[PDB]
């Protein structure tokens, strides 16, 4: 199972994440990539536009730079620490 | 097993494949072909990605006699999981021309392999269908409630085509035809209006003839079809509704805006008259000059 | 005197074509490889009936990525299914480059040349295709000897042919070292064309579906209001406009991005639709009831 | 017929990948000019057949096709701040008399 | 000449037989060292000597046929060996031009067997020699025979030979060729449409049957396959030989065609139709065509021009002399595309042909 | 009189040819639209050099 995981992983292929820089339309959304250059990418009708919001992390195919789906927003330890403190 | 099989999308590559397989086994004219269909499943949309011919022998003396080479389907699967893991066993295609009660038995053998419900994709390779020559059917197990035992049956699931982006750009580039219906210009949809009527007329006939066959050929009473037909007569539009009177005002709006837009095109054509006409008047002058200029050199 | 050394017109079937766009384009950035199965007839007609993807390898494309172990294994499965036909060549994908063979892909070609002397090496560039079918080319080895003693003219005796021209560096490298290119042609049946378009019953079923009437109202309102705005501009166009030099007129009266023409276009689209809309509604009402 | 031709031509121009812009730093007799291609480093590159070392002038801004860097057209065109200030400013209005007192 | 190799050498050899045409007592004799059984320098010359023999002796070549016939019948079967392949290619072309208009059912039969062998490139050659022999009879044995074998054959060169070979036998048969013409266009195969456009041409040649034009124009517009488009336009020149003065009008419209193929066929149509004594209209049509960017359009254009303006006194129409010097300009330029140059050199050779 | 039949045929022919170029117009429109679409990269327009470049 563990050696099968590698063969599966090579077929899944590394993903590019951006983040919603700025809604422009339902059909076209402006993202700024984590790697770098600003892009206008598209959104599939498989993923509702209400989920997509400013500062939510999103995942896009390389091939065509289009958002497949939402990801949970980046885990920031800092704001977790702030909440915790008091006890 | 899995009950998520709400939609079926079909790559055109599959379609292309099904005729190819039929001809390479040299099966023809009421010789049948069974192959595996591979793709994604345990998901609402069953995505049929590919198909591949299997060893199959067809016997006409006993229709419940066939060969399938069971080991081979396992083996081939092993290879393709290595190529791409997303492909899995998802059932089996038949070439038709029609569904049979032997295809029920056949289903059962694929059921063992499959961790989904085996999808039976009836690809008519001959394509005699006016529309879709492809039906999709899923084996379900349900009590047929009439005083009859548990019945296993193939219930129709509408299917649609779909193309991967990567294939699709190439599909479009191959094609260049003007189409029977593209939803183009006025004249094109107009053809579709003549077609759509003749569509309905054949379609309704099929219903009338089933109703005969129930009391003349003793086809089992299916209270379900007849139930749906009650809903047709019950929800039927009628005239003398205030809805007619509403449509009747609407008619008048649709022609009146048309009328005014007709009148506006009159003004545009009349404009071009003037402009081309002004040019002609000038053309008379340049022509006369030619003759005038010839005199001066002489 | 000697050999023509002729290079085959590589006749690529539609089925083979569609698996190539699918497997290669999807598999970006990682290269994919595979054999071509076909039949060779004449001395210039090679029909490539089928292709397949040989199991992925992390050496991507190399002499050793490809294997006989993979070759044989796959063959044996298709052997039973009777769909087996001889290997007529090999393909691989370059998703980062245009159509040309690496120094390595020539060596790879050279093993398939020894197998079968009509073996092709086909470089598929699918992401930087914007029509799909473009920028895919098929190639064949020419010897180092062949360049010296000038056997390039023979191969194209009495045929117009196509010698590819895109990529200047990478092309001229390929044209005078990697391989000789000749034309690549796509053929298909008229049984299959019917399948590629797909006929549906919902083409015509959609023609007697009557969409809601809120949507007819909106179109009536909208189209008319729009042309009110460009009708002011049209008055401006024709206020004078009759003094000399046509160019002068087009900047002053803004006959660039022509307002007369735009009025006509908006008018025609709406005019056409409102006639479809009456035509369907009349058919629906009598026909049903 | 011409309209169908026009839409097609528009299509074919856009394809062109690259396409830049340098400046002729100096001219040499080798059927070349040293160009500091502005987004890139430097390139000493041969002239296209259409515009030659004769025609070229030092410090003239130029267009270039693709990654080839063949000459396209010379550009008179220069980005300067004074020009940019004029565009904000526009055609200066107004009659002497109004000022007059 | 010595710089040649491969199939360019076989072309060189058949060209000699165009020069040495006539002089029939020595017709065999000039080509005599070159003939197989007396030559062995190169195989391209051995094939190309036979081809050149039938071109000398074209038309009436009865005595000459019997020499060729030995080679055809011998080599009827086996031809996979490459020496025989060339030999036979060039032979089959000879024999077909020599037995032209002779109705030799024996020759027809022979090449029939060559057709069934699926001799690689000589099969195309054979297909062509069949209709040549039996030209203009519309023989029913031939029609069904050629028809059936074209769809069975999947070798495209053979498919081509047959398409054109069908047209040839249905030369000048009018309505009696209409039965076949119907069949060729309905075949969706492109090969078959290409030959169909010229079947219509030969059969309805010399008569401006109104019905014929209506068919050619309708195929040209409706068939997006490109070689077919080009063919049908070329084909108009033959049907409308009778009044060839209406031809510049039709194809004017088709000179302004966006499609490159269509424009090529304009040039050719004019060339053929108006090949007799000059007509001024045609020159003016062909002038944008000469400098058209498409490489084959320029080529076609320059050739068409020369057929029209076939040797005329330079003074008489001053225009003739200048179009000749344009040909020269093209060749002087070594930056001109090879193709453009191929047409130019030939065109000056037609202007000064014979 | 057969010559004057040909003028009716030429007239007929060119309605079909101009009709053809209508269809073509539209189909060409499709192509252009595909370019407009995703994926895209955002830039900063500087200055014109030219009405069309």
- The 3-class secondary structure across A22-81, one letter per residue, is EECCCCEEEEEECCCCEEEEEECCCCCCCCCCCCCEEEECCCCCEEEEECCCCCCHHHHH
Helix/strand/coil for C27 = coil
Contact assessment for residue E172 and residue E159, using Cβ atoms and an 8 Å cutoff: no
- In whole angstroms, how far apart are CA E344 and each of A2, A18, E14, E350? 72, 60, 21, 10
CB pairs under 8 A between B and F: 7
Nearest residue to E169 (alpha-carbon basis) of E192, E211, E140? E140
- In terms of Cβ atoms closer than 10 Å to its own Cβ (0-12, 13-18, 19+), residue B176 is exposed
Contact assessment for residue E205 and residue E182, using Cβ atoms and an 8 Å cutoff: no
What is the maximum alpha-carbon separation in chain B?
A: 114
Report the alpha-carbon distance of residue D98 to residue B59 in Å, rounded: 108
- Characterize the bridge pairing of strands C184-187 and D42-46: unpaired
Report the alpha-carbon distance of residue D47 to residue E67 in Å, rounded: 63
Tokens of C237: 């166009």
Cis previous bond, D62, omega within 30: no
Phi-psi region at A55: left, alpha or beta (left = phi > 0; alpha = psi -120 to 50): left
Contact assessment for residue E174 and residue E210, using Cβ atoms and an 8 Å cutoff: no
Report the alpha-carbon distance of residue C82 to residue B27 in Å, rounded: 11
- In terms of Cβ atoms closer than 10 Å to its own Cβ (0-12, 13-18, 19+), residue B163 is buried
Tokens of A39: 């892009």
Contact assessment for residue C89 and residue C108, using Cβ atoms and an 8 Å cutoff: no
Residue E47 half-sphere exposure toward CB, CA atoms < 13 A: 25
- In terms of Cβ atoms closer than 10 Å to its own Cβ (0-12, 13-18, 19+), residue B116 is buried
Tokens of E217: 């124009």
To test the contact with chain D by mutation, choose from E258, E293, E334 the residue with the greatest count of D C-beta atoms within 10 A, namely: E258
Tokens of E206: 């010399």
Report the alpha-carbon distance of residue C190 to residue C163 in Å, rounded: 29
Report the alpha-carbon distance of residue E11 to residue D89 in Å, rounded: 75
Q: Which residues of C are annotated as a binding site?
A: 92, 94, 105
Residue range of the domain that includes B102:
3-177
To test the contact with chain F by mutation, choose from B173, B178, B179, B191 the residue with the greatest count of F C-beta atoms within 10 A, namely: B178
Report the first-to-last Cα separation within chain D, whole angstroms. 64
Phi/psi at B13 (5° precision): -65, -35
> Which parts of B51-185 fold into alpha helices (H)?
70-83, 102-113, 165-174
Nearest residue to C133 (alpha-carbon basis) of B108, B44, B168, E243? B168
Three-class secondary structure assignment of C155-214: HCCCCCCCCCCCCCHHHHHHHHHHCEECCEEEECCCCHHHHHHCCCCHHHHCCCCCCCCH
Q: Which residues of C are annotated as a binding site for Zn(2+)?
A: 92, 94, 105
Residue at token pair 């590159």: D45
Nearest residue to C275 (alpha-carbon basis) of C230, C204, C219? C219
- Characterize the bridge pairing of strands D61-65 and D70-75: antiparallel
Report the alpha-carbon distance of residue A15 to residue A70 in Å, rounded: 13
Report the alpha-carbon distance of residue E205 to residue E197 in Å, rounded: 12
F22 touches chain B (CB under 8 A): yes
Residue at token pair 């081939």: B76
B86/A7 touch (CB, cutoff 8 Å), yes or no? no
C157/E6 touch (CB, cutoff 8 Å), yes or no? yes
- In whole angstroms, how far apart are CA E259 and each of E78, E230, E300? 44, 10, 15
Contact assessment for residue A36 and residue A13, using Cβ atoms and an 8 Å cutoff: no
Order of all β-strands in the sheet with B134-143:
B150-157, B134-143, B119-123, B88-94, B34-40, B45-53, B7-10, B160-161
Report the alpha-carbon distance of residue E282 to residue E304 in Å, rounded: 9
Phi-psi region at D12: left, alpha or beta (left = phi > 0; alpha = psi -120 to 50): alpha
**What is the DSSP-derived secondary structure letter of residue D48?**
P
Nearest residue to C101 (alpha-carbon basis) of C153, C33, C11, C40? C33
b or e along C109-142 (b: 16 or more beta carbons within 10 Å of the residue's beta carbon)?
Answer: beebbebeebbbbbbbbbbebeebeebbbbbbbb
Report the alpha-carbon distance of residue B54 to residue C83 in Å, rounded: 10
E217 contacts in F (CB within 8 Å)?
9, 13
**Residue of A10, A62, A63 lying closest to C56 (CB–CB):** A10
Contact assessment for residue A37 and residue F41, using Cβ atoms and an 8 Å cutoff: yes
- In terms of Cβ atoms closer than 10 Å to its own Cβ (0-12, 13-18, 19+), residue D8 is middle
* B199 contacts: CB under 8 Å, gap ≥ 6: B130, C201, C204, C205
D42 sits in which H/E element: strand D42-46
Chains D and A touch (3+ CB pairs under 8 A): no
> Which parts of B135-185 fold into alpha helices (H)?
165-174
Nearest residue to E307 (alpha-carbon basis) of E331, E328, E282, E325? E282
Tokens of A81: 């620490």
> Which parts of B175-185 fold into alpha helices (H)?
none
User: What sign has the CA pseudo-torsion C28, C29, C35, C36?
Assistant: positive
To test the contact with chain B by mutation, choose from C22, C49, C127, C214 the residue with the greatest count of B C-beta atoms within 10 A, namely: C22
Contact assessment for residue E324 and residue E348, using Cβ atoms and an 8 Å cutoff: yes
Tokens of C238: 């024709």
Phi/psi at C200 (5° precision): -140, 160
Contact assessment for residue B117 and residue B3, using Cβ atoms and an 8 Å cutoff: yes
- In terms of Cβ atoms closer than 10 Å to its own Cβ (0-12, 13-18, 19+), residue C169 is exposed
Q: How far is B2 from chain C (nearest CA, A)?
A: 28
Q: How far is E336 from chain D (nearest CA, A)?
A: 14
Report the alpha-carbon distance of residue E113 to residue E127 in Å, rounded: 10
Report the first-to-last Cα separation within chain F, whole angstroms. 56
Report the alpha-carbon distance of residue D51 to residue D63 in Å, rounded: 11
F46/D79 touch (CB, cutoff 8 Å), yes or no? yes
F26 sits in which H/E element: helix F2-36
Cis previous bond, E125, omega within 30: no
**What was the elucidation method?**
cryo-EM
B85/A11 touch (CB, cutoff 8 Å), yes or no? yes
Report helix, strand and coil shares of chain D as percent, to nearest 5. Answer: 25, 30, 45
Chains D and B touch (3+ CB pairs under 8 A): no
Contact assessment for residue C91 and residue C51, using Cβ atoms and an 8 Å cutoff: yes
* D99 contacts: CB under 8 Å, gap ≥ 6: none
A64/B82 touch (CB, cutoff 8 Å), yes or no? no
Report the CATH number at residue B86. 3.40.140.10
Three-class secondary structure assignment of D55-95: CCCCCCEEEEECCCCEEEEEECCCCCHHHHHHHHHCCCCCC
Phi/psi at B7 (5° precision): -130, 150
B273 sits in which H/E element: helix B242-297
- In terms of Cβ atoms closer than 10 Å to its own Cβ (0-12, 13-18, 19+), residue C266 is middle
Tokens of B105: 């038995």
To test the contact with chain A by mutation, choose from C24, C30, C125 the residue with the greatest count of A C-beta atoms within 10 A, namely: C30
Report the alpha-carbon distance of residue B209 to residue C100 in Å, rounded: 63
- In terms of Cβ atoms closer than 10 Å to its own Cβ (0-12, 13-18, 19+), residue F50 is exposed
Report the alpha-carbon distance of residue E178 to residue C214 in Å, rounded: 58
Nearest residue to C139 (alpha-carbon basis) of C117, C113, C121, C163? C121
- In whole angstroms, how far apart are CA E116 and each of E111, E146, E150? 9, 11, 11
Long-range interactions of A63-68: CB distance < 8 A, separation 24+: A63/B165, A63/B166, A63/C25, A63/C26, A63/C28, A63/C127, A64/B165, A64/F38, A64/F39, A65/A16, A65/A39, A65/A41, A65/F38, A65/F39, A66/A41, A66/A42, A66/F38, A66/F39, A67/A29, A67/A31, A67/A41, A67/A42, A67/A43, A68/A44
B154 sits in which H/E element: strand B150-157
F22 contacts in B (CB within 8 Å)?
185
Contact assessment for residue C161 and residue C91, using Cβ atoms and an 8 Å cutoff: no
| Other CB atoms within 10 Å distance of the CB of residue E209 | 20
Cis previous bond, F39, omega within 30: yes
Tokens of B258: 């048309």
Phi-psi region at E111: left, alpha or beta (left = phi > 0; alpha = psi -120 to 50): alpha
| Other CB atoms within 10 Å distance of the CB of residue B48 | 27
Three-class secondary structure assignment of C30-98: CCCEEEEEEEEECCCEEEEEEECCCCCCCCCCCCCCCCHHHHHHHHHHHHHHCCCCCEEEEEEECCCCC
Helix/strand/coil for D21 = strand
Tokens of C135: 């920028």
b or e along B177-202 (b: 16 or more beta carbons within 10 Å of the residue's beta carbon)?
Answer: eeeebeebeeeebeebbeebeebeee
Nearest residue to E126 (alpha-carbon basis) of E138, E113, E140, E143? E113
Report the alpha-carbon distance of residue E227 to residue E150 in Å, rounded: 18
Report the alpha-carbon distance of residue A32 to residue A19 in Å, rounded: 6
C contact residues 37-76, partner B, Cβ 8 Å cutoff: 50, 53-56, 73-74
Angle of helix E210-222 versus helix E226-239 axis, rounded to 10: 160
Tokens of D81: 């701040």
b or e along C76-108 (b: 16 or more beta carbons within 10 Å of the residue's beta carbon)?
Answer: ebbebbebebeebbbbbbbbeebbbbeeebbeb
Nearest residue in D to F46, CA atom:
D79
Residues D83, D86, D88, CA angle at the centre, nearest 5°? 120
Three-class secondary structure assignment of B101-138: CHHHHHHHHHHHHCCCCCEEEEECCCCCCCCCCEEEEE
Report the alpha-carbon distance of residue A73 to residue A84 in Å, rounded: 19
- In whole angstroms, how far apart are CA E299 and each of C111, E229, E257, E290, E302? 42, 18, 17, 8, 6
Helix/strand/coil for B11 = coil
Contact assessment for residue D23 and residue D60, using Cβ atoms and an 8 Å cutoff: yes
In Å, how far from its chain's centre is CA C102?
A: 23
**What is the DSSP-derived secondary structure letter of residue B220?**
P
Report the alpha-carbon distance of residue C177 to residue C167 in Å, rounded: 14
Tokens of C107: 């060596």
> Which parts of chain E fold into alpha helices (H)?
6-19, 27-30, 43-56, 62-74, 82-98, 105-117, 122-133, 140-152, 156-169, 178-186, 190-203, 210-222, 226-239, 247-252, 260-273, 280-290, 295-308, 318-332, 338-351
* E291 contacts: CB under 8 Å, gap ≥ 6: E298
Nearest residue to E156 (alpha-carbon basis) of C3, C86, C43, B175? C43
Nearest residue to E233 (alpha-carbon basis) of E197, E203, E259, E209? E197
F38/A42 touch (CB, cutoff 8 Å), yes or no? yes
| Other CB atoms within 10 Å distance of the CB of residue B33 | 23
- In terms of Cβ atoms closer than 10 Å to its own Cβ (0-12, 13-18, 19+), residue B297 is exposed
Contact assessment for residue D13 and residue D66, using Cβ atoms and an 8 Å cutoff: no
Tokens of C168: 């200047």
Helix/strand/coil for D34 = strand
């Amino acid at each position: 199972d563990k050696t099968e995981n590698d063969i599966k992983a090579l077929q899944s292929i590394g993903q590019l994440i951006g983040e919603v820089m700025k809604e422009l339309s339902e059909e076209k959304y402006i993202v700024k990539a984590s790697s770098g250059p600003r892009y206008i990418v598209g959104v599939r009708n498989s993923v509702d536009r209400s989920k997509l919001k400013k500062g939510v992390r999103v995942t896009l195919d390389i091939t065509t730079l289009t958002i497949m789906r939402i990801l949970p927003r980046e885990t920031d330890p800092l704001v977790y620490n702030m909440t915790s403190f008091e006890q | 097993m899995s009950l998520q099989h709400e939609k079926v999308t079909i790559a055109p590559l599959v379609l292309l494949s099904a005729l190819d397989h039929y001809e390479r086994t040299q099966t023809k004219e009421n010789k049948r072909c069974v192959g595996v269909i591979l793709g994604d499943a345990n998901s609402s949309t069953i995505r049929v990605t590919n198909s591949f011919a299997l060893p199959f022998e067809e016997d006409e003396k006993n229709s419940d006699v066939w060969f399938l080479d069971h080991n081979y389907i396992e083996n081939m699967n092993e290879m393709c999981k290595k190529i791409n893991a997303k492909e899995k066993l998802i059932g089996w295609y038949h070439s038709g021309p029609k569904l049979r009660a032997s295809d029920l038995k056949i289903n059962e053998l694929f059921k063992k392999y499959t961790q989904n419900n085996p999808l039976l994709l009836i690809v008519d390779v001959k394509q005699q269908g006016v529309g879709l020559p492809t039906d999709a059917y899923v084996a379900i197990e349900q009590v047929k409630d009439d005083g009859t035992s548990t019945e296993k049956t193939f219930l129709h699931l509408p299917c649609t085509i779909e193309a991967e982006e990567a294939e699709e750009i190439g599909v479009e580039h191959l094609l260049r035809d003007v189409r029977d219906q593209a939803a183009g210009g006025l004249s094109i949809r107009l053809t579709n209006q003549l077609k759509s009527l003749k569509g309905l007329q054949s379609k309704l006939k099929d219903v009338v003839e089933y109703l005969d066959k129930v009391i003349n050929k003793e086809l089992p009473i299916n209270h379900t079809i007849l139930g749906k037909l009650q809903d047709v007569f019950n929800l039927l539009p009628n005239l003398g509704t205030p809805d007619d009177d509403e449509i009747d005002v609407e008619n008048h709006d649709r022609i009146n805006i048309s009328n005014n837009l007709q009148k506006a095109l009159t003004v545009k054509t009349n404009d071009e008259l003037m402009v081309i006409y002004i040019s002609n008047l000038v053309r008379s002058i340049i022509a006369f000059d030619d003759l005038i200029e010839n005199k001066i050199q002489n | 005197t000697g050999r023509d050394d002729t290079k085959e017109t590589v006749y690529i079937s539609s089925i083979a074509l569609l698996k190539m766009l699918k497997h290669g384009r999807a598999g970006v950035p990682m290269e994919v490889m595979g054999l071509m199965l076909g039949e060779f007839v004449d001395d210039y007609t090679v029909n490539v009936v089928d292709v397949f993807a040989m199991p992925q390898s992390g050496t991507g494309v190399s002499v050793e990525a490809v294997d006989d172990v993979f070759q044989a294994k796959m063959m044996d499965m298709l052997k039973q299914t009777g769909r087996d036909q001889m290997v007529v060549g090999w393909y691989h994908s370059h998703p980062g480059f245009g159509c040309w063979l690496s120094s390595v892909d020539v060596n790879t070609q050279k093993s398939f040349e020894q197998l079968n002397s009509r073996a092709v090496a086909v470089v598929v560039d699918p992401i930087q295709s914007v029509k799909g079918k473009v920028v895919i080319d098929a190639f064949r080895l020419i010897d180092t000897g062949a360049l010296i003693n000038n056997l390039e003219p023979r191969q194209t005796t009495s045929n117009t042919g196509l010698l590819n021209k895109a990529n200047i560096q990478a092309l001229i490298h390929g044209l005078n070292r990697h391989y000789y290119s000749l034309n690549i042609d796509y053929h298909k049946t008229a049984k299959e064309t019917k399948m590629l378009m797909n006929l549906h019953k919902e083409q015509w079923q959609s023609g007697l579906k009557m969409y809601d009437y809120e949507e007819k109202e909106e179109s009536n309102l909208a189209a008319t209001k729009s042309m009110v705005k460009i009708a002011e501009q049209y008055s401006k166009r024709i206020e004078e406009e009759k003094e000399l030099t046509e160019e002068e007129l087009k900047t002053r009266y803004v006959g660039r991005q022509d307002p007369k023409k735009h009025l006509s276009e908006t008018a025609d689209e709406t005019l056409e639709n409102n006639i479809v809309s009456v035509l369907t509604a009349g058919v629906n009402s009598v026909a049903i009831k | 017929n011409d309209k169908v031709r026009f839409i097609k031509d528009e299509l074919r121009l856009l394809q062109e990948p690259g396409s830049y812009v340098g400046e002729v730093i100096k001219i040499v007799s080798d059927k070349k000019v040293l160009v500091k291609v502005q987004p890139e480093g430097k390139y000493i590159v041969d002239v296209a057949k259409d515009i030659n070392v004769k025609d070229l002038k030092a410090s003239q801004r130029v267009c270039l096709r693709s990654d080839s860097y063949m000459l396209h057209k010379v550009l008179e065109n220069k980005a300067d701040p004074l020009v940019s200030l004029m565009m904000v400013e526009k055609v200066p209005d107004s009659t002497y008399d109004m000022v007059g007192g | 000449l010595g710089k040649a190799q491969n199939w360019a050498k076989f072309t060189a050899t058949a060209s000699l037989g165009v020069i040495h045409k006539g002089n029939l007592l020595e017709g065999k004799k000039v080509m005599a060292p070159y003939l197989p059984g007396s030559r062995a320098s190169s195989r391209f010359i051995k094939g190309g000597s036979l081809y050149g023999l039938g071109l000398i002796y074209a038309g009436f070549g009865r005595d000459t046929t019997d020499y060729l016939k030995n080679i055809i019948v011998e080599n009827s079967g086996t031809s996979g060996d490459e020496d025989v392949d060339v030999l036979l290619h060039g032979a089959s072309l000879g024999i077909g031009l020599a037995a032209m208009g002779s109705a030799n059912i024996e020759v027809y039969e022979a090449l029939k067997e060559v057709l069934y062998n699926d001799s690689a490139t000589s099969g195309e050659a054979a297909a062509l020699g069949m209709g040549l022999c039996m030209l203009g009879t519309g023989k029913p044995e031939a029609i069904h025979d050629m028809f059936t074998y074209s769809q069975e054959t999947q070798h495209g060169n053979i498919t081509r030979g047959l398409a054109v070979g069908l047209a040839l036998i249905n030369y000048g048969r009018q309505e009696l060729a209409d039965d076949l013409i119907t069949k060729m266009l309905a075949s969706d195969e492109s090969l078959l449409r290409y030959g169909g456009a010229f079947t219509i041409a030969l059969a309805y040649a010399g008569t401006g049957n109104n019905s014929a034009v209506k068919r050619l124009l309708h195929v040209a517009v409706s068939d997006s396959n490109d070689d077919v488009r080009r063919a049908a336009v070329i084909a108009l020149g033959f049907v409308l030989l009778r009044d060839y003065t209406t031809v510049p009008r039709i194809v004017q419209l088709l000179s302004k065609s966006h499609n490159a193929h269509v424009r090529c066929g304009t040039a050719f149509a004019l060339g053929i139709a108006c090949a007799g004594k000059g007509l001024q209209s045609a020159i003016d049509v062909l002038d944008p065509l000469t400098k058209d960017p498409v490489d084959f359009v320029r080529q076609a254009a320059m050739i068409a021009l020369s057929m029209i303006l076939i040797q005329q006194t330079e003074k008489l129409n001053p225009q003739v002399a200048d179009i000749n010097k344009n040909f020269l300009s093209v060749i002087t330029n070594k930056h001109q595309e090879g193709l453009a140059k191929f047409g130019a050199c030939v065109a000056q050779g037609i202007m000064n042909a014979g | 009189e057969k010559e004057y039949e040909l003028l009716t045929l030429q007239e007929d022919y060119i309605k079909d040819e101009q009709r053809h170029l209508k269809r073509e117009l539209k189909r060409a429109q499709e192509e252009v639209k595909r370019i407009q679409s995703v994926p895209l990269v955002i830039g900063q327009f500087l200055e014109p050099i030219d009405q069309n470049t």
